[PDB]
A paper describes a structure:
In response, one family of large bacteriophages uses a nucleus-like compartment to protect its replicating genomes by excluding host defence factors. Here we find that the bacteriophage nuclear shell assembles primarily from one protein, which we name chimallin (ChmA). Combining cryo-electron tomography of nuclear shells in bacteriophage-infected cells and cryo-electron microscopy of a minimal chimallin compartment in vitro, we show that chimallin self-assembles as a flexible sheet into closed micrometre-scale compartments. We find that the shell is primarily composed of a single protein, chimallin, which self-assembles through its extended N and C termini into a closed compartment.
Further reduction of the structure to focus on an individual protomer resulted in the highest quality map at about 3.1 Å resolution, enabling atomic modelling of the chimallin protomer. Chimallin folds into a compact two-domain core with extended N- and C-terminal segments. The N-terminal domain (residues 62–228) shows little structural homology to any characterized protein, adopting an αβ fold that is topologically similar only to an uncharacterized protein from Enterococcus faecalis. Although chimallin lacks the acetyltransferase active site residues of AtaT and related toxins, this structural similarity suggests that the jumbo phage nuclear shell may have evolved from a bacterial toxin–antitoxin system. The chimallin protomer map contains three interacting peptide segments from the N and C termini of neighbouring protomers. The N-terminal interacting segment (NTS: residues 48–61) of each protomer extends anticlockwise (as viewed from outside the cube) and docks against a neighbouring protomer’s N-terminal domain within a given face of the cubic assembly, thus establishing intra-tetramer connections. Two extended segments of the C terminus (CTS1: residues 590–611; and CTS2: residues 622–631) establish inter-tetramer interactions. Notably, the binding of CTS1 to the chimallin C-terminal domain resembles the interaction of the antitoxin AtaR with the AtaT acetyltransferase toxin, further hinting that the phage nuclear shell could have evolved from a bacterial toxin–antitoxin system.
Numbering used by the authors:
A (entry chain A): 62 to 306, 319 to 581
B (entry chain B): 590 to 611
C (entry chain C): 622 to 631
D (entry chain E): 48 to 61
E (entry chain D): 280 to 285
Write the structure that this text describes.
């Protein structure tokens, strides 16, 4: 009766911290502690990185817990009952990392930290949990652990500085007064992006913001000084409106997966999040959201084929791409005749990701007991970013900011033949391609996602069965995420407010 | 009861076009 | 439902 | 560039 | 109390 994935991790982290301090990379001002599950009676053991300062004589402690799930032990499952006619049955669900980190868990962690550090009445502030995925060998993953430790220290410094109170980041200071301009570059990708711990993330459209400083006969050709600010990963999905059979049958919804800053920038502040998120709306400058749909020349993975859209069209068969006659001449005609011109913007909020502190805030703003406070905080932050007077473009009193669609998305990875990929590659188009002519199977798959009648546990069961049926037997789930839809007017108001606030971005 | 589609996705759609200096 | 978690803002 | 010097969070990266 | 622990 013992746990062996905590002591080894603690030893590795202590050695890494010693090495980093030796190389003059960090400062010996933080502590690393172990949260054993055996002597605290908690679901999962965790590692906490605590850094403390003093504010007006009151000690303040910032903590960044790291959950350590283990595959050698099984947590008890959750039972639910549903009724069908005269018979009742029991469904056995599964428990994720997110449900483990509850209020009681954080309370016990804070009490333990306060007792350990010698300060019983010290204030404790969270900095954002980040679980360490299982099936990861700690012996040969030193680089990821080092980067994660550095990022955790940076996050603790960020939250401490935010609590202390510093100058907000504003776009008025981005002028540079040196005759430079900001340019935004769009990009279409096919290989998934990677997290700080190697977790793949699906990313088809990437929007970045750079600084263009070409003044004159500039020297240092082919050399750039970290001219990059933001990066947003987006991918498009198709949704079908319930109309019986001039409006196009399908409507395109764009999902935002990851928002992050440049690698060089070591600071993360709330006003940077909105500035980075404002780049999402710029993807509609030249219908760039439709670029991944066009066929590529030479290869055909047959997973993202757009010809499947003809399965439910007036003609039963599928439209055949990869043909000599087919080109961009009638690809536009197809998109005009079967896709709505305007897209929809959605975000996949995750309470355990790197940007947990904003995903939780947006989830609270979407709906709950803390609905007014979150909206007021968001409005205050947006006012702080770029001067003020946001009331002229938006009115949070009588206008929702974020809306919850009641959809839960699993987070996992499946090992393709070549390399590990992301579980979110399976979408409506992928399912339509998988089920060639069987309309009933596609309708069942679509209902397994957003059926309001079905219990969420049953929908999750059907979604887990479909993934095994289509993708393969190598699927490995890692977490949970929730999908939300932004207000249509909010995005436009934010974009117009930033544009009027002296921000000028040029591109193709 | 059988699913038929999303009757609420069509309410939120961007009407304007991205504003860039170009 | 609408389960919530700790928030540093409030 | 100047952003890092304006905030100066402890812990060098890259 | 002590949920998720046996």
């Amino acid at each position: 009766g013992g746990d062996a994935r905590a002591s080894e991790a603690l030893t590795v982290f202590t050695r890494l911290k010693e090495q980093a301090v030796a190389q003059q990379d960090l400062a010996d001002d933080f502590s690393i502690l172990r949260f054993d599950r055996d002597q605290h009676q908690v679901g999962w053991s965790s590692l906490v990185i605590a850094k403390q300062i003093s504010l007006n004589g009151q000690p303040v402690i910032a903590v960044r817990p790291l959950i350590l799930p283990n595959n050698s032990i099984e947590l008890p499952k959750r039972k639910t009952n549903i009724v069908n006619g005269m018979q009742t049955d029991v469904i056995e669900s599964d428990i994720d990392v997110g449900t483990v980190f509850s209020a009681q868990y954080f309370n016990r962690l804070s009490t333990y930290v306060q007792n350990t550090l010698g300060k019983p009445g010290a204030k404790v502030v969270l900095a954002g949990p980040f679980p360490i995925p299982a099936d990861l060998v700690l012996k040969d993953s030193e680089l990821q652990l080092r980067n994660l430790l550095i990022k955790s220290v940076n996050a603790c410094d960020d939250i401490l500085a935010l609590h202390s109170g510093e100058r907000p980041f504003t776009i008025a200071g981005l002028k540079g007064q040196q005759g430079e301009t900001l340019a935004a570059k769009v990009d279409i990708r096919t290989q998934p992006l990677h997290d700080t711990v190697g977790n793949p993330i699906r990313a088809d459209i990437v929007v970045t913001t750079q600084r263009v400083r070409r003044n004159g006969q500039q020297e240092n050709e082919f050399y750039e000084t970290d001219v990059k600010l933001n990066q947003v990963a987006m991918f498009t999905n198709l949704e079908r409106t319930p109309q019986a059979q001039t409006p196009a049958p399908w409507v395109a919804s764009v999902v935002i997966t990851d928002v992050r800053n440049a690698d060089g920038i070591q600071a993360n502040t709330p006003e940077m999040y909105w500035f980075a998120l404002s780049n999402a709306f710029r993807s509609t400058h030249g219908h760039a959201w439709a670029r991944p749909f066009l066929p590529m020349t030479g290869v055909a993975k047959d997973m993202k084929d757009i010809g499947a859209l003809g399965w439910m069209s007036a003609l039963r068969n599928r439209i055949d791409t990869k043909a000599a006659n087919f080109d961009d001449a009638q690809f536009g005609q197809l998109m005009l005749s079967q896709v709505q011109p305007n897209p929809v913007f959605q975000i996949d909020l995750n309470r355990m990701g790197e940007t947990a502190q904003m995903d939780s805030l947006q989830l609270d703003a979407a709906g709950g007991p803390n609905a007014q406070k979150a909206a007021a905080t968001i409005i205050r932050q947006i006012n702080n970013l770029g001067g003020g007077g946001f009331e002229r473009f938006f009115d949070h009193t009588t206008q929702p900011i974020l809306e919850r669609t009641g959809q839960v998305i699993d987070l996992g990875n499946w090992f393709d033949g070549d390399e590990k990929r992301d579980r979110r590659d399976l979408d409506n188009l992928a399912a339509l391609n998988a089920a060639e002519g069987n309309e009933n199977e596609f309708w069942g798959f679509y209902g397994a996602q957003l059926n309001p009648n079905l219990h969420p546990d049953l929908r999750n069961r059907q979604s887990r069965n479909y993934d095994r049926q289509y993708l393969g037997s190598t699927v490995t789930y890692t977490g949970k995420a929730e999908r939300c839809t932004y207000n249509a007017k909010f995005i436009e108001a934010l974009d117009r407010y930033l544009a009027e606030a002296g921000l000028q971005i040029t591109m193709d």
